[PDB]
Ligand binder design. Structure first.
Ligand SMILES: Nc1nc2c(ncn2[C@@H]2O[C@H](COP(=O)(O)OP(=O)(O)OP(=O)(O)O)[C@@H](O)[C@H]2O)c(=O)[nH]1
Ligand SMILES: [Mg+2]
Lengths: 309, 166
């Protein structure tokens, strides 16, 4: 209907050319106020603090994805030069001869924010390697039939964990507590995005359909989009609102905010968004980060008072 | 003497607890001042007036509390971190609501555009154009640049408030 957001600040002329897996915010330095970390296609590793650019750094290769365990960690080829506030800290490499497709995080035990963390990686060979809370070593190597296109983790490493994996073949696979399911869901097109929601996983296939899936295989709802999917992301507001939404941006230029079946906000960036991040950046908790095809950076913020009901 | 109620709101980390510490006597002052938790109530004397001062927290988590004092308050001091260009809008929203409320009477609002010393500071005319203070047409208001650390301007400000509170 209308857009719920507050317009923070806009930089039409950032250098940034990156898509979602190469964008991230974390507290690398620890002075409370969080920083935006981007693995550009410049093979340059830009860092933004607040309204301004802080650093640039040089990246050996062109990057695949960046995560954090306060230690940033770019992936590329078969190496993962995990930096750390903010200078090289390892060059851990995959035992068999492998190329990296995807990477994400897992909670170590607390299943709560700002806790101990275990890095996770998918390999073109067909494995998902979960590692140590110091990034020390492979903790569970699970070999799985298909090439992973992208992945999502819901859970805790100690308590319980379910990981959802979208393969390039157009199938959705599941792993619960290190154990691999034989439950295989067939998609309608090859997957474009994967989001961990409340009680289900969201796939976006190329035919402009978002789909909701439960670990069992039930299809909860289906979102049918007017244009093509360029971006998807878990927007997670905690507090008395407690909703775990889905933002999806399209090439026609709109950025939509579905709350389960329902649309809650739509705004349009002048150029198509390629990257979406929702989280604490700056001192404000609910903030939306967009990197567009015009290479501009846009920061928007969710009012305390906005109802997503 | 005469006592009046002053509420001090503002986003987190703007220097409300610091700005009120410079109103307290040099001996009663705290050395390292801490992130206000919940809220804190000091009394400060300046002239015929004796200020009943309310220091709120600014973190989102507690903003739900500012509404608690809007009825009794006789004046509002709104503090703004000048280096935080980012969360300028978030300040505006919180300020809009505070005015909008039905319990907040049309009292004088003194705005401190604090942290003028910081290099990247936002200048008193850009700040009040973000916050849109030019629109405020029903009450006396003034923006004053400042430095909470030092007390710089804090005099220039409270003196103003005290004037229309008399
Ligand atoms: N450079 C500079 N730093 C300041 C100034 N005023 C406060 N600070 C620093 O800002 C930090 C937070 O100040 P506080 O006064 O506790 O923040 P607050 O306004 O009370 O808001 P709360 O988070 O609700 O307590 C501390 O490091 C202060 O030293 C200032 O005028 N200039
Ligand atoms: Mg305070």
């Amino acid at each position: 209907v209308r857009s719920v957001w507050l317009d923070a600040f806009n930089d039409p002329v950032a250098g940034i050319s990156a898509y979602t897996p190469c964008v991230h915010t974390c507290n690398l330095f620890g002075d409370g106020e969080n920083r935006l970390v981007i693995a550009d296609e410049d093979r340059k590793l830009k860092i933004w603090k607040g309204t301004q650019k802080a650093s640039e750094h040089p990246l050996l290769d062109t990057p695949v994805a960046i995560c954090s365990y306060p230690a940033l960690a770019v992936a590329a080829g078969s190496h993962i030069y995990i930096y750390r506030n903010l200078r090289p800290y390892y060059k851990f490499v995959l035992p068999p001869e492998t190329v990296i497709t995807c990477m994400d995080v897992v909670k170590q035990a607390i299943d709560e924010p700002d806790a101990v963390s275990c890095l996770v990686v998918g390999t073109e060979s067909g494995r998902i390697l979960i590692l140590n809370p110091a990034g020390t070593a492979i903790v569970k190597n699970i070999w799985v039939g298909i090439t992973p296109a992208m992945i999502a983790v819901q859970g805790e490493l100690d308590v319980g964990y379910r990981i959802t994996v979208a393969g390039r073949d157009g199938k959705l696979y599941h792993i619960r507590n290190g154990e691999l399911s034989q439950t295989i869901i067939q998609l309608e097109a090859q997957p474009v995005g994967l989001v961990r929601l409340a009680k289900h996983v969201a796939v976006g296939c190329m035919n402009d359909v978002v789909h909701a899936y439960t670990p069992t295989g039930h299809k909860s709802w289906s979102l049918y989009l007017p244009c093509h999917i360029l971006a998807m992301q878990r927007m997670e507001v905690t507090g008395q609102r407690n909703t775990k939404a889905l933002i999806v941006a399209l090439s026609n230029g709109e950025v939509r905010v579905y709350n389960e079946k329902l649309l809650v906000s739509v705004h349009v960036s002048p150029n198509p968004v390629t990257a979406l991040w929702f989280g604490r950046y700056g001192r404000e908790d609910n903030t939306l980060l967009a990197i567009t095809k015009s290479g501009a950076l846009d920061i928007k913020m969710l009012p305390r008072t906005a109802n997503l009901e | 003497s005469k006592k009046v109620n002053v509420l001090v709101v503002g986003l987190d980390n703007s220097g409300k607890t610091t700005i009120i510490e410079r109103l307290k006597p040099r001996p009663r002052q705290a050395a390292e001042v801490a992130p206000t938790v919940g809220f804190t109530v000091d009394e400060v004397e300046k002239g015929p007036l004796t200020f009943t001062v309310f220091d709120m927290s600014g973190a989102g988590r507690y903003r739900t509390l500012w509404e608690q004092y809007y009825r009794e308050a006789d004046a509002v001091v709104f503090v703004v971190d000048s280096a935080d260009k980012l969360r300028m809008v978030v300040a505006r929203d919180e300020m809009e609501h505070m005015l909008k409320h039905s319990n907040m009477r049309k009292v004088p609002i003194l705005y401190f555009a604090n942290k003028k010393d910081i290099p990247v500071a936002m200048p008193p005319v850009e700040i009040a154009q973000a916050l849109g203070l030019d629109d405020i047409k029903d009450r006396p208001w003034q923006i004053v640049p400042s430095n909470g650390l030092t007390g710089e301007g804090v005099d220039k400000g409270i003196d103003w408030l005290a004037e229309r509170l008399s």
